[PDB]
Design a protein around this ligand. Structure first.
Ligand SMILES: [Mn+2]
Ligand SMILES: [Mn+2]
Length: 363
């Protein structure tokens, strides 16, 4: 509803390891007056799914309630229904997919009844993007305009398709539910076509839960795992994707992993880079690395130290009536400095430039 006068740049982090996985995450409120993102990150699932893992980002809209509920309860709604637990043995691919769909519909209905019964005043909604990782499969899950991708063999192997109201099938559903897409928005208001919550958009008489103006139905994609070739998974809200493309962010993350194995720090760098690229939204990123993720390179670390020192010297010489940081950044940009991080560019080096600037002009 409003912007802060200065961004809240404080990072909240988590990290972990297990089942042959390493992960880090970072979330940051940014320019927004409230933090309405949430996330789930768990290696080892209950009830015979110890070798399974689950990661998810939730981008809350008009409040954090739906997102916060999801982040604590979506997983059990997915795994603790009859469709997921279908077969006698390990869940089949269909069990997993049907189980995920049922879990989204059932948590949505659960929240709706909780809200009706307790006379809930919030009209919040949430996206969800995540991965359910088994020994042999990565199941991508998407509902909304948060986004996930898989980097395999140094390339974007897969990314989720954002649910935008102007997408043909989304637009069709909206119109069949009595609504319209005005520019990019449901009835000129809502920027997503799919979400949990947003119950005001789920009141069309004579249409099922998945045929409302806004649908809680997730899209699920089974990717068979590749032990040799799988590198990393990125999950993030639109606060990240609004200012960095799939290949850019994939290239950027690779460049950062070649310099560090600290996954929280890599996530911090993504979020700061997007802030400095002009993102004014809440930002959350989860980075899940597989055994063959890029490795720290002695040469990359050396190039990074050389670049940092170079930037430090440039700031000094530009300072020489001292220019402010905005103007220093502008001057550095006009220098077309080579060997900046792919995708991240000068924005990804701002913390280094600003720390230099502060040392030289501390007042
Ligand atoms: Mn939000
Ligand atoms: Mn957002």
């Amino acid at each position: 509803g409003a912007f802060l006068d200065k961004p809240k740049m404080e990072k909240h982090n988590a990290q972990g390891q297990g089942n042959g996985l390493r992960y880090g995450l970072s979330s940051m409120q940014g320019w927004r007056v409230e933090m309405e993102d949430a996330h789930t990150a768990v290696i080892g699932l209950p009830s015979g799914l110890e070798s399974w893992s689950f990661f998810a980002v939730y981008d809350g809209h008009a409040g954090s309630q739906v997102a916060k509920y999801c982040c604590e309860h979506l997983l059990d709604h997915i795994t603790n229904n009859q469709d997921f637990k279908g077969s006698a043995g390990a869940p089949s691919v269909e069990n997993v997919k049907n189980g995920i769909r049922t879990g989204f519909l059932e948590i949505d209905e659960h929240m709706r009844v909780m809200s009706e019964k307790k006379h809930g005043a919030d009209r919040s909604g949430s996206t969800a993007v995540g991965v359910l990782i088994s020994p042999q499969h990565t199941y991508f899950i998407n509902c909304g305009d948060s986004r996930g991708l898989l980097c395999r063999n140094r390339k974007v192997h897969f990314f989720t398709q954002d649910h935008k109201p102007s997408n043909p099938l989304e637009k069709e559903r909206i119109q069949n539910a009595g609504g319209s897409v005005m520019i990019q928005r449901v009835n000129g208001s809502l920027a997503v076509s799919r979400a949990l919550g947003d119950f005001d958009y789920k009141c069309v008489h004579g249409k099922g839960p998945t045929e409302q103006l806004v649908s809680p139905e997730p899209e699920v994609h089974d990717i068979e795992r590749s032990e040799e070739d799988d590198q990393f998974i990125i999950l993030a809200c639109d606060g990240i994707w609004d200012v960095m493309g799939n290949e850019e962010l994939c290239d950027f993350v690779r460049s950062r992993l070649e310099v560090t194995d600290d996954l929280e720090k890599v996530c911090n760098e993504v979020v700061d880079t997007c802030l400095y690229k002009g993102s004014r939204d809440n930002m959350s990123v989860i980075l899940i690395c597989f055994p063959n993720a890029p490795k720290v390179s002695p040469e990359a670390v050396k190039k990074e130290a050389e670049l940092d020192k170079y930037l430090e010297c440039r700031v000094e010489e530009i300072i020489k009536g001292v220019p402010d940081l905005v103007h220093v950044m502008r001057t550095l940009a006009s220098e077309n400095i080579p060997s900046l991080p792919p995708g991240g560019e000068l924005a990804s080096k701002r913390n280094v430039i600003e720390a230099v600037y502060n040392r030289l002009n501390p007042y």
